[model samples]
Target: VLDFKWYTRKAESWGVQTFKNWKENLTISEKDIITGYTGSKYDPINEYLRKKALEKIENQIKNLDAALQKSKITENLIVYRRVSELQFGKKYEDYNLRQNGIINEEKVMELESNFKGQTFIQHNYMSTSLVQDPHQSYSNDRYPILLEITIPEGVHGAYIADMSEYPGQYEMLINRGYTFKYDKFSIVKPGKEYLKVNLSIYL
Candidate 1:
């Protein structure tokens, strides 16, 4: 289980991007996040603020963790309110700013339209992962999505997210459940005979 501490480090990395221009800057390294990240190996004020900054990050992560678990059983559509922000470097009016954590209305309609006639379970998630790009070393913020899907049933196949049809973040189908056949970043195997998939996308 990735606890609050793990997320605190993620929060700290994000903090470095947000406050890069401050009088001084913070660093996130492999060894320590609080001291050198110990002691930078010596700035005291930064240490306190670093901890303070992560408070909200922990709160936000906690909220989402609760929501993800609740999404598994909750019924009725809930139009989750999103809260967004700009990334490391982006135009104020950039097309895909994630809308300051808010769902774009036009995109919302498209997401809903995908399952308009289908009976399915839905999950609205934000910051599912505010992942910074390793190559870009730049941006990170809310990841927004409305996932309306049915619980899939299969005796086998590697476990994955709601489904790959939506804005999925799933790995390949492995040689475990449903008697694996093929797997890849884009597509997976075992055919539809033993699996069913329902998905919708609005971008």
Candidate 2:
């Protein structure tokens, strides 16, 4: 059985985002402004104050790790991330996926130029999809990228946040600052075109 004795205590400490606007006039740094948009929830007014906002969410990941120790399920998991045209280098607008239902070679080369053989650390908590399709909440016009993550055989800072449409359906919540190496990139067609990126976590 999984150990969750500490899970309740730790999760409670991490507060949820509120809708109320806060501290619109305060500006700390340009760095905070960038972080605010990248986090789990969007709050333009309090974007600068997200330094602490991210800190608390990272702890929630730790709590999830503690709760899953009993299973210690080590396996490769595939997660999906949607990136807007602006975020993915703005080259997507030039290529049309719907017109031909094929991913252009130029697009693949562009992705390789930026990410191949590089290591990246996401600064905010990543709420990703276990399924390979686009999430309903986000815009369909965005690019769909798949991330394959390898979890090791011990305590880890990733877990399922909640249930889904069917049994074993998962929403993988990865911790902030979790480093991954970009091994390679490939394009695949499963109704919709996706940029499948191979990534691995370092111990």
Candidate 3:
């Protein structure tokens, strides 16, 4: 589920909260440095305040978990999704470095293994099977039936990919159950940033 907010109202609320914390944490000299005479912006100050607010919200949610437990429809239902930003040169070898000008096979296999067990279930949309092994890499020879999510209308626009790192396949798999096999095939390219994925649920 996604949270929708009125942009203006949300911004106003955020601004008030931000100013309150800024005044609480910063000194007059620091404030002057933040709003400088040289016109250089202290972007880090904004980042720090936002991080503080996020930490507060996270703690509040943790505290409320017990109260929210009673309202849960199913104890088994859960979803997990994340995106990671990647540096082009650091994450992958330059496109011209390799013999074939493609990602190294070993590097691709390494990433597939790293992202092996990360899973998610779409609420009211799919049911995931059990994860076979958490320790195994994504490209293990055993192609376990990880999980399945049902497609209400088979062969629609549904697709999955790593949203953070780009390349490989923009559109990876489709249909009711898209199986990922670590031992069977390569999921990503070495030196090129990409997301590791697993089947959490499918119908």
Assess candidate 3 and give its lDDT. Answer: 0.28
What TM-score does model 2 achieve against the real structure? 0.53
Ranking by lDDT: 2, 3, 1
Error of 2 at 140 (Å): 7.2
Q: What's the C-alpha lDDT at position 107 in model 2?
A: 66
lDDT of 2 by residue, 54-150 (tens): 6654444443333323222344444555554333445665544333446766867877897788787655455554444334554233555556555
Runs of candidate 3 exceeding 4 Å displacement: 1-59, 73-80, 85-105, 114-196, 199-203
TM-score of each: 0.21, 0.53, 0.23
Residue lDDT tens for model 3, 15-130: 23423432344344433432231132222223334567566444433322222222212112222222221212245433322233333456545555654444332211111111
lDDT, candidate 2, at 96: 49
Best by TM-score: 2
- Candidates in order have lDDT scores of 0.25, 0.45, 0.28
The per-candidate count of clashes, in order, stands at 14, 0, 16
Number of the top-ranking candidate, with lDDT as the measure: 2
Per-residue lDDT of candidate 1, residues 1-203 (tens digit) = 11112243443343344323321321222112211211223222333345555664444334323322322211111111112222112332344423444445554344335433443221212212111121111112332321212212221112112222211221111111111111111111221111112232221
Q: Which RMSD does model 2 reach against the true structure?
A: 11.6
RMSD of each: 19.9, 11.6, 17.2
